[PDB]
Amino acid sequence: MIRAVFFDSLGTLNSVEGHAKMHLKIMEEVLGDYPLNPKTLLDEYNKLTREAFSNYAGKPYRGLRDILEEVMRKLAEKYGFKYPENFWEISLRMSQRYGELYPEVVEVLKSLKGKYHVGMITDSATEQAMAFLDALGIKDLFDSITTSEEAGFFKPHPRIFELALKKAGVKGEEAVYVGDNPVKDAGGSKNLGMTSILLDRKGEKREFWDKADFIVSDLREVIKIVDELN
């Protein structure tokens, strides 16, 4: 019986659109009137960071701040603008203002909280995850928050899911994982026996739907699935 529902972060609870808007504002503040299109800087930053994150999926945890700051160091040297020593602090300030939840998130978390264990499982440093949940106003809505930093490994490594399950006191088969990445979220959680729900908000991933037990475009569908399973 489903006793716990676990959620991914980016693309699942906080929007990619807010992420992109937030990060453009970060680059605009980095650059000022430097003669570089902030959108061009952002696209190159995203290209490099995506490659780095891909390299480390499933692998031992390493600090994301060191990776992002090195990428920025490279980009500052490539393009000739002054490296921002306060890059991280700029980023935090912009997260607090421009971080954005999908419209149904609070409704969904509220409807589940109390009746099931409500958890988050995220690739993130712990302090950074807790700060952003606070900034979005949803920290209190979780019974557990489990991170790659705690487990020692990035998704889809089994230990990050194992830890979340152990925090909640449930078996994998008594738990659901909702996330937007078919490999890291659906495939990763399945290795622990969890029921996997792929969130495909824009229907962009039908190539990979077979990788999940269920497909949804809106998190309000989750509660119906759990009830139906129970």
Ligand X SMILES: *CC(=O)c1ccccc1
3-state secondary structure of 121: strand
Q: With CB cut-offs between 5 and 8 Å by kind, which of Mg ion, ligand X, none does residue 180 bind?
A: Mg ion
Q: Applying CB under 6 A, which part among 18-26, 30-38, 71-79, 216-224 lies near ligand X?
A: 18-26
Of residues 12, 15, 91, 147, which one binds ligand X by CB under 6 A? 91
Q: Which amino acid is at 114?
A: G
Cα 102 to Cα 36, 51, 65, 99, 130: the distances in Å are 31, 26, 25, 10, 18
Sheet with 117-122, strands from edge to edge, namely 144-147, 117-122, 4-7, 175-179, 195-199, 214-216
Based on the shown chain and the rule CB under 6 A, indicate whether residue 22 belongs to the binding site for ligand X.
yes
Based on the shown chain and the rule CB under 5 A, indicate whether residue 58 belongs to the binding site for Mg ion.
no
Shortest separation between residue 10's beta carbon and Mg ion, angstroms = 4
Our CB check for ligand X shows the closer of 124 and 196 to be: 124
Of residues 123, 149, 174, 180, which one binds Mg ion by CB under 5 A? 180
Based on the shown chain and the rule CB under 6 A, indicate whether residue 25 belongs to the binding site for ligand X.
no
Based on the shown chain and the rule CB under 5 A, indicate whether residue 10 belongs to the binding site for Mg ion.
yes
Give dist(CA 84, CA 79) in Å, integer.
13
Q: Applying CB under 6 A, which part among 22-30, 48-56, 70-78, 139-147 lies near ligand X?
A: 22-30
Our CB check for ligand X shows the closer of 132 and 142 to be: 132
Shortest separation between residue 96's beta carbon and ligand X, angstroms = 8
Closest CA relative to residue 128, chosen from 117, 139, 143: 139
Which residues, 106 to 165, sit near ligand X by CB under 6 A? 128, 132
48 contacts 74 by C-beta, under 8 angstroms: yes
3-state secondary structure of 138: coil
Cα 219 to Cα 69, 83, 107, 166: the distances in Å are 33, 40, 9, 24
Query: Applying CB under 6 A, which residues contact ligand X?
Result: 19, 22-23, 26, 91-92, 95, 128, 132
Query: Which residues participate in the annotated binding site for Ca(2+)?
Result: 8, 180
